[PDB]
Design a protein around this ligand. Structure first.
Ligand SMILES: O=C1CCc2cccc(c2)Oc2ccc(cc2)C[C@@H](C(=O)NCc2ccccc2F)NC(=O)[C@H](CC(=O)N2CCC[C@@H]2c2ccccc2)N1
Ligand SMILES: O=C1CCc2cccc(c2)Oc2ccc(cc2)C[C@@H](C(=O)NCc2ccccc2F)NC(=O)[C@H](CC(=O)N2CCC[C@@H]2c2ccccc2)N1
Ligand SMILES: O=C1CCc2cccc(c2)Oc2ccc(cc2)C[C@@H](C(=O)NCc2ccccc2F)NC(=O)[C@H](CC(=O)N2CCC[C@@H]2c2ccccc2)N1
Ligand SMILES: O=C1CCc2cccc(c2)Oc2ccc(cc2)C[C@@H](C(=O)NCc2ccccc2F)NC(=O)[C@H](CC(=O)N2CCC[C@@H]2c2ccccc2)N1
Ligand SMILES: O=C1CCc2cccc(c2)Oc2ccc(cc2)C[C@@H](C(=O)NCc2ccccc2F)NC(=O)[C@H](CC(=O)N2CCC[C@@H]2c2ccccc2)N1
Ligand SMILES: O=C1CCc2cccc(c2)Oc2ccc(cc2)C[C@@H](C(=O)NCc2ccccc2F)NC(=O)[C@H](CC(=O)N2CCC[C@@H]2c2ccccc2)N1
Ligand SMILES: O=C1CCc2cccc(c2)Oc2ccc(cc2)C[C@@H](C(=O)NCc2ccccc2F)NC(=O)[C@H](CC(=O)N2CCC[C@@H]2c2ccccc2)N1
Lengths: 222, 222, 223, 222, 222, 223, 222
């Protein structure tokens, strides 16, 4: 798995690959790993498939549960805490091979400067949380390759479209070097998924746009 | 790794993928795993890269060593025996993770019928050897996928070119399901290697021919 | 990690580096490890990031929880004991890799001599606590380099600013010899954090003054 | 440790950091990890300090030993095989923590094409060797950051000085992310060492040139 | 650590060193290990610092707790039994390295013979207790050197002042042979602590007097 | 144990403490850990006493063995190599507990510049060797405290006598913070040993000069 | 077992107890543990009885073997090194429970003056040796008690007879606190053995002199 997230002026982008494996064997080509957790938050999870899916589903329910009980959504810091507490509670199972490693992207509607109101929070298996301040992060077996790609590419990010293009290229570099991260599949027409969040909320990125960017990267490197 | 070998009227073809890995990480993209070991014999090896390469080199040296000492090449059965003895001697190292599993193809010039002089021989880690009688064989982590692919496609093998096509398609199917087997890289222009052996001896298959077959396979799958 | 704390005439200083790691890999560059836990108390924690941040947040809540319930803050000795009990309760998880080692600096509003009212308390993984009397202390993987540096630098501590300078130079020496402690990052503009506590309370040190002192130390050592 | 090596038109460059550690503690700041092993060959080694230094000295003695005994230097392939056998012979000690992981850069005087006579060979702990054909390679705990950096910078390599600049920037990126790899120390004036090899042989790069490149990189990032 | 206790005509003295260690490293120089537990009782503890501190604190509150509840202090035997029960309750944790070993000195106001009301009680990690009748006892990593020193010097104990000097000299001998016991620090001006207990109760011994005895012992040794 | 080594203009000084231990128990007060191994070389060894002594005796015999067989002494590099090989050959026993870590000080008669012809070489348990280019080094349980001390004191080193004083003060700091390193014993008159090496060869430093420097240090720190 | 040894002006004394045990059970009451191994050297050995006895006999044979071969006895330093090598060679068996710890008391005929010719050498299980300079030493399970007793009594040592009295009293204190060290047996008439060594050589101390000193100590403490 590789899931990336990056800030751009006035929003945040999260993108993730589509592969699941069982050892060396490919067991999935269509996996959706990036979830719109609520109107202003997206979560992407690496690790054991059963746990990652359960984490995303339970987390979204917990956030909406608070909003309906209290009439107001949690602050973004509260959302961070609840995800950290979920991961911390899984630590024993994670030591037994039931690992979930999330990455959190959001847009804080209560931040002062909306141009920088995008948020990226990385986590570890002990429930540690760190709000990223350098503009991008990645999680999963390909995250090193994606972070090093984004390091060289982040200067190109000026808006949502270029942020999306950089995100897709980082996922391409991750799959280029990590066999557990799936590249774009032109035969089957399967591409990474992506969510973009700004002051108007989170939206799934249409597959056609990601297909366009993926084909452009492939064309460029040939 | 996946190495395939199959018989066609009047010879054999062996083809192998180009990938090396370290865990999840891709560490090689142009590995050549199919060696012409003498004028009528090719060997393909899966397993630990260091041991596999050393096996191929030492095996070819051993065969040519005997030929120069005695003025005639070993019989095909003799070549089998020497390869098996080599694998058997590595069993302890193989149990420590230094494994080499070879696959042997050849044209036996001392056979009865020239059209049935093709030979395919598989091996196991204990030095066992089995002369394949059912037309094809494969070795490596994607070998089961490649053999089940060849089971359905072998009926269309009627000559050297269709033999080659089926071998390349089998490797394509292995890469489709085994992340440790490399698919055709149309971006970098890297394709499986192949050797064809008939009464005129063993020759490397030009990459342009394999590239054309791989693109036709990819187009048919889309 | 290296957290340092030292007494100066009238108060106390605590400073800490900004690095987190996973094995050899650098995983954070702007980590804030020195917390204002109440108006006269600062806590700096080393060890497992998740546990360290949870300790600081829970400890600050615990002290304020008592203050609001009882109408008065805890005595400084009460604050020591609650922090020690928190560490002791974590001993089992700490043996399994979830370690948190705090360092405590404070200003005792109920002390006898206001110019010796500074306090520094070090802890161990079993919940042990020891009030330091020799003027400085450190915790973390670079703490021995820092303490041995402060041993030679402590004499120049006459007020709050010179105390801050010594704390920053100790952290510089710690990062000089310990790869798990971060030194000043002049390219990114990232520097250690610091808190000063005196009779008027605990305040964060502005990044600018720490940056000036770090550059002074740097070019003093480069020639 | 990070050792990088890359090809440029007419030669190769190899560069390595200066740090030695004992766990978290820095125990060395001026270590030289890149050795001129003969007039057309440089070796950079990562791993246990004692073993790395021994490997370099013995390997250089072995090559000159053969040259004086036989009157001609070994072919580049023979040089590869000798280093590979040395690594393979150390496998048991490396499993006990006495690991040496070399990277080999050379200029093949016997190549028919002097523009592409540069050679880069990587190795693994079992003595496996692979001639790199993508133009760059790295070894050590920061090699993945360095390789992902050179992936984005390699298109700027047009001569020896651009190649040297990319090699220094790759080492900068590795130290940026790997605490066991040393960045440029402006306070002490200690910079990565480098060797450049062309048809005229292998020569140490003067520290002044590497310092100027490091200052340019540092000011660019600021 | 070394804690000594010895009986003199009409009373008892207890003295302890000032050192704490973390393995080989010295981690404390002014630890106070001798506690006035109530008006007629002192306890010195060796072992894991956290457990020793906690033991002295909780034992003192337990004795005063009983006094305030029932209007009368515990009999000396009751004080012994409660301290033994506390050690016995710590046994499992003590076997994991959370060991506290106390030594109890006191003056029994309800003693049968008012001239021989001095009391010394030693304990073991299992909670065993033994009322010492040979006039002195010690605990800690230097207790054997201190007890053998006192075996020779105890004949000199004729009043409270000579008993104090012997206790301090026994601590000096323990520090002489045991690096985990701290000796007098003439540079910093730090000396063992002592408590003296007679019919008028237990009082802290002024540091000036201990320093005087320590300097005299140092001069008699040199 | 703590052994310190220190370059000064025109030579080197090496100094070592006198303590040996068995667990917490002190087993020796006058151990000599710094050996003149030939006319221009000294070695101090930390670790298992039996192994350290064996190492120093055998190494000295080896260097002189070559000199008598070949009519010239080994180059300094050759001397480094032989010590490294001796340590590497002991690695198996060292993993079993028979550990010896040497520190090599010497004056290279063949060096280009005689003023900086002093040489300090550190070693690890795997036979690794590194020629120290920063001027000082230390080995043993207290070596980190000693190196941090010398880091602050090294600018005072202008000749052999100031270098000897810094070395003695480093050993004093190491003993101050490491119970396995013995401090100056004024009651018994026992002080660290030291060897000074310059162009005229290696020579033991008399106990009286070291006692003088130790007393001056103790007095300065006592106020 | 306790073996003590002491320097006195112009000579040296060594004494040892007579007990052997198998666990708690006493197995011997008249064991002689101090051997005249040379005209000017004695050796006393603690540990496994079989190994201690064998060590004594072999060491004595070895020294006399060299003397008859070369015509001159070994220097005292050579006698030290030979006993050290013998202990080191037993180290593997010592770890399996075949332990011998010797203590060496000699008179060095080649020393400067007869007043400083006495020699005490202590050894450890690794073959370490140390020439003792504080005037006395002990070995065995009661050596700590004996050394502390001798620390208080050594000022009284002015000649061989006061040295012998201090030696017997140290052994008395060891047996007083160590059940593995035998005390004077008045019922059976068994007492510590002792060897005195001066310029006239090594002499077995008469039992009657030891019995006098034992009864004087026993009466002095009654
Ligand atoms: O390998 C397994 C077996 C279960 C297991 C138990 C204990 C330890 C363990 C693995 O050890 C492990 C083995 C393998 C992994 C982790 C741990 C990698 C991980 C992965 O690919 N994860 C990518 C991924 C990320 C987020 C969401 C979904 C998702 F597939 N793969 C896995 O867990 C695979 C997943 C798999 O094959 N299937 C087939 C049908 C259902 C399940 C699937 C669910 C949802 C989507 C896609 C597939 N399970
Ligand atoms: O992983 C390693 C390190 C050795 C090792 C350590 C621990 C366990 C282990 C293997 O256990 C293993 C780990 C991994 C494997 C086996 C065993 C898979 C195997 C493979 O891909 N094998 C495919 C292959 C087949 C035939 C010929 C060449 C060839 F690469 N990979 C490997 O051995 C990899 C190979 C590798 O990265 N390199 C980089 C530089 C040199 C070497 C290479 C040589 C030649 C060609 C291509 C690459 N070595
Ligand atoms: O290594 C990990 C994973 C958990 C783990 C697994 C196995 C062993 C282990 C710890 O065992 C350990 C592995 C590593 C350490 C301890 C234990 C060192 C310690 C550290 O740097 N600590 C410095 C520090 C001190 C105070 C507050 C924050 C802070 F980072 N690092 C850690 O725990 C690292 C921290 C880390 O990478 N991340 C990434 C995103 C979130 C988390 C972070 C939180 C908050 C601030 C900065 C970073 N987690
Ligand atoms: O850690 C050690 C001790 C040996 C050891 C014990 C246990 C595990 C282990 C290694 O396992 C290990 C622990 C640590 C490592 C490897 C293995 C990392 C490795 C390194 O930094 N290596 C970088 C490097 C690469 C090439 C050439 C030289 C060079 F230092 N560090 C090391 O081996 C360190 C090195 C070290 O401190 N010293 C001090 C003086 C001599 C030696 C040095 C020699 C030469 C140059 C610079 C320093 N030795
Ligand atoms: O070693 C540690 C860490 C806990 C630990 C981990 C692993 C094994 C272990 C103990 O196992 C042990 C390791 C070491 C020991 C015991 C067990 C010896 C013991 C000691 O010196 N004890 C002397 C002493 C006796 C009575 C009262 C106080 C006192 F310090 N030392 C200790 O526990 C040391 C103490 C220490 O460094 N600190 C620093 C700040 C707080 C604590 C302190 C409290 C109070 C007073 C003085 C110091 N802790
Ligand atoms: O503890 C022992 C026994 C061997 C042993 C057993 C189990 C574990 C172990 C070592 O593991 C160890 C236990 C203890 C240590 C290391 C390893 C520390 C080391 C030390 O002080 N080393 C300082 C030192 C350095 C150089 C030269 C001499 C010298 F003492 N101490 C030691 O080896 C001690 C030394 C000791 O008591 N004796 C008494 C009789 C002669 C011998 C001595 C020789 C020379 C000088 C001074 C003393 N041996
Ligand atoms: O216990 C045993 C059996 C050997 C053994 C097995 C397993 C573990 C072990 C020792 O481990 C041990 C168990 C017990 C000890 C050491 C190791 C103590 C040691 C001792 O007393 N030693 C005092 C002593 C010192 C020097 C010379 C002689 C001498 F007896 N006791 C011993 O070895 C005892 C000795 C013993 O009972 N006998 C009875 C008949 C002959 C033999 C004897 C020989 C020579 C002189 C006096 C007695 N052997």
């Amino acid at each position: 798995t590789t899931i990336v997230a990056l800030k751009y002026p006035g929003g945040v982008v999260m993108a993730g690959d589509r592969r699941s494996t069982q050892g060396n064997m490919i067991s999935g080509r269509d996996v959706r790993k990036v979830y719109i957790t609520d109107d202003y938050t997206a979560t992407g999870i690496a690790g054991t498939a059963a746990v990652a899916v359960e984490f995303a589903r339970l987390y979204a329910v917990e956030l909406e549960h608070y909003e309906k009980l209290e009439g107001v959504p949690l602050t973004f810091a509260g959302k961070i805490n609840r995800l950290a507490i979920m991961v911390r509670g899984n630590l024993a199972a994670a030591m037994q091979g039931l690992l979930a490693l999330p990455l959190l992207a959001g847009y804080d509607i209560h931040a002062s400067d909306p141009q920088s109101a995008g948020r990226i929070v990385s986590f570890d298996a002990a429930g540690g949380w760190n709000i990223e301040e350098e503009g991008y992060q990645a999680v999963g077996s390909g995250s090193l390759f994606a972070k090093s790609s984004m390091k060289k590419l982040y200067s190109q990010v000026t808006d949502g479209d270029s942020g999306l293009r950089v995100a897709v290229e980082a996922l391409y570099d991750a799959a280029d070097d990590d066999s557990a991260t799936g590249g774009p599949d032109l035969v089957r027409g399967i591409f990474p998924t992506a969510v973009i969040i700004d002051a108007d909320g989170a939206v799934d990125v249409p597959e056609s746009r990601i297909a366009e960017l993926a084909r452009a990267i492939i064309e460029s490197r040939s």
